[PDB]
Amino acid sequence: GNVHLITTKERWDQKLSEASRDGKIVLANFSARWCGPCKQIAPYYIELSENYPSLMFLVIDVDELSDFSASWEIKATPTFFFLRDGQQVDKLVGANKPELHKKITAILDSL
């Protein structure tokens, strides 16, 4: 059960601490419940999370964390950030399955 749903600024702040603790890169999926391209990739994202234990997979519910989201300047859903210690290593706007998988692949070998 490797995708964590973030609903609170405290739970975000906790999970980022854990990943830092363990030298994991955080994949954050800023997405929405009633969002069609977000539903489209949601099972793929769970499947990815099973296959890549050295990434911490988060989903950020943008309807719930609306202020935190404006702060990350979310302009479309889903939006993905790869974060190391909070610094963006990469970013993907949209449910693009191939592209997401390629970014995970690239961040994994090298960083």
The full set of domain ranges for the chain reads: 1-111
Active-site residue set = 35, 38
Give the method used: X-ray
The amino acid at 101: H
Query: Resolution in A, one decimal?
Result: 2.2
- Strand pairing report for 25-31 and 3-6: unpaired
CATH 3.40.50.300 given to domain 1-111: no
* Among the listed residues 105, 70, 76, 69, the one whose alpha carbon sits nearest the alpha carbon of residue 90: 105
* Among the listed residues 85, 108, 91, 107, the one whose alpha carbon sits nearest the alpha carbon of residue 16: 85
Tell me the CB-side half-sphere exposure of residue 23, using CA atoms within 13 A: 2
SS (H, E, C) the chain: CCEEEECCHHHHHHHHHHHHHCCCEEEEEEECCCCHHHHHHHHHHHHHHHHCCCEEEEEEECCCCHHHHHHCCCCCCCEEEEEECCEEEEEEECCCHHHHHHHHHHHHHHC
